[PDB]
């Protein structure tokens, strides 16, 4: 009579968030859900070091096969952490490996809402941060005076094999940065389809966000989006009452979009942007809404077989300060809602993409959310939203558990 969990990758971190998720797994999930299909991985900074990222390899492989991943917040083993945690070596951020390993098209950064508690945006906002390209994968050098040349040699079509000059310039400064990057745009077709599909389901008005007026190479991000929308979605948006007859898809400049995020406190909109613009704008979105914990960070990629790989994370870290407080015998109140939304999304996608116990899984994950929201409504949520009379971390975990049935 327990729910059969679909295959799903579970990535454990450390510190306060792992302490919390251990309690959630043991007291909310496991008594109601057979988690035999989960493949669990220990991603403590120490276990990455001890296995020399063998664990990360096993995460990415598991993710490609299973297509549904929940990842806890983790400690990136930076220089600071090597000394602190007593490790052998440093290890970089695992996001690049995940985005490439799973053919990432977007990080979905959506506002998280609680029925009965008003946050910054009244209604759901959706945001797609294009997951590849841009300055994140640039080649560069810091240089003095000299000549900079950029060439391109196509490998197919009429001009195949003929090298052309993209740019050439004389650097006249003693101190300068020289930078080259690319934006791969083939997966913007996939991105547009995913984005507009999401926006239609949510009944939110979509917007495309670039600096294409000046950064003219960005034009195709808009053109691909507009074409997909017009041909495959506009009729549907009008029919669903989301947009009026003759309303065109709107393009916003990135510097205008920063203003709109502050103005549009009603919510009820979607934005899609390039990698960096999405990075900056979604943290703005976090601040307007409440804080980073109330925005999702959901990586979506395209499997070779046509289905989607979906990884889900909370947007806060491991809350080391709170872990320290716990280890000083001081009361804590970690709001688990960001992580729970991630776990819900992963469990739902696991059930959906594998077609295993879908009705019962969706019902259960909906039930967890409903119970949590009702507790917050009553002033029995965590202290971030319910003040000093709110529940401690452990009190909140019990409160949910005894209402779950």
Residues of this chain, 124-143, that bind a copy of itself according to CB under 8 A: 133, 135-136, 138-143
Tell me if residue 202 falls in helix, strand or coil. helix
Spatial contact of 132 and 101, defined as CB atoms under 8 Å apart: no
CA distances to 127, 170, 234, 356, 405 from 4, rounded to whole Å, are 32, 64, 39, 7, 17
Contact between 384 and a copy of itself per CB under 8 A: no
Is residue 211 a contact point for a copy of itself (CB under 8 A)?
yes
Pick from 8, 112, 224, 400: which binds a copy of itself (CB under 8 A)? Answer: 224
**Sheet strands side by side (includes 250-253):** 38-42, 8-12, 68-71, 308-314, 296-302, 104-108, 126-130, 269-273, 205-210, 250-253
Q: Which residues are annotated as a binding site?
A: 74-76, 93-99, 129, 136, 211, 255, 260, 279, 283, 316-321, 335
State the nearest-atom distance from the C-beta of 91 to a copy of itself, in Å. 13
Query: Residues annotated as binding site for D-threo-isocitrate?
Result: 93-99, 129, 136, 211, 255, 279
Q: Does 215 bind a copy of itself (CB under 8 A)?
A: yes
Cβ atoms within 10 Å, residue 156: 7
| Residue 148 vs 399, nearer CB to a copy of itself | 148
Q: Does 168 bind a copy of itself (CB under 8 A)?
A: yes
- Contact window for a copy of itself (CB under 8 A) among 47-55, 62-70, 249-257, 330-338: 249-257
Per-residue x/- track, 347-376, a copy of itself (CB under 8 A): ------------------------------
| Residues of each annotated binding site for Mg(2+) | 255, 279, 283
CB of 280 to a copy of itself, least distance (A): 5
DSSP code per residue over 290-308: S-GGGBEEEEEEE-TTSPE
Lookup: tokens for 202: 């949510």
> Which one of residues 74, 183, 296, 297 is an interface residue with a copy of itself (CB under 8 A)?
183
* DSSP letter for each residue of 315-357: SS---HHHHHHHHTT-------HHHHHHHHHHHHHHHHHHTSS
């Amino acid at each position: 009579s327990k729910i059969t969990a679909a295959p799903m990758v579970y990535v454990r971190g450390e510190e306060m968030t792992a302490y919390v998720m251990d309690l959630i797994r043991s007291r909310w999930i496991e008594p109601r859900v057979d988690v035999g299909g989960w493949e669990t991985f220990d991603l403590r900074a120490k276990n990455r070091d001890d296995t020399e990222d063998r664990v990360l390899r096993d995460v990415i492989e598991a993710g490609k096969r299973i297509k549904a991943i929940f990842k806890e917040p983790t400690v990136t083993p930076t220089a600071d952490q090597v000394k602190r945690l007593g490790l052998r070596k440093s290890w970089g951020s695992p996001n690049g490996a995940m985005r490439r390993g799973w053919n990432g098209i977007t990080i979905s950064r959506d506002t998280i809402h609680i029925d009965g508690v008003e946050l910054g945006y009244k209604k759901p906002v959706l945001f797609e941060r294009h997951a590849v390209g841009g300055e994140y994968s640039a080649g560069y050098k810091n240089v003095g005076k000299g000549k900079l040349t950029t060439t391109f040699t196509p490998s197919e079509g009429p001009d195949a094999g003929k090298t052309v000059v993209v740019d050439e310039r004389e650097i006249v400064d003693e101190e300068a940065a020289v930078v080259t990057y690319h934006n791969p745009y083939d997966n913007v077709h996939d991105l547009a389809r995913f984005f507009f599909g999401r926006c239609l389901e949510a009944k939110v008005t979509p917007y495309v966000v670039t600096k294409k007026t000046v950064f003219k190479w960005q034009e195709p991000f808009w053109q691909i989006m507009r074409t997909v929308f017009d041909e495959e979605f506009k009729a549907q948006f009008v029919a669903a009452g989301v947009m009026k007859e003759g309303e065109e898809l709107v393009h916003l400049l990135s510097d205008a979009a920063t203003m709109k995020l502050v103005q549009w406190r009603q919510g009820g909109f979607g934005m899609a942007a390039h990698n960096y613009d999405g990075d900056v704008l979604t943290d703005e979105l976090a601040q307007v809404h409440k804080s980073p914990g109330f925005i999702t960070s959901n990586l979506v990629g395209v499997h070779e077989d046509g289905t989607l790989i979906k990884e889900f994370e909370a947007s806060h870290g491991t809350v080391a300060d709170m872990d320290e407080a716990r280890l000083r015998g001081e009361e804590t109140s970690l709001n688990p809602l960001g992580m729970v939304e991630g776990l819900i999304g992963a469990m739902n996608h696991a059930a959906d993409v594998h077609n295993i116990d879908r009705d019962r899984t969706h019902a259960f994950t909906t039930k967890m959310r409903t119970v949590i929201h009702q507790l917050f409504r009553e002033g029995k949520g965590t202290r971030d939203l319910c003040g000093p009379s709110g529940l401690t971390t452990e009190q909140f975990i019990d409160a949910v558990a005894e209402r779950l049935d």
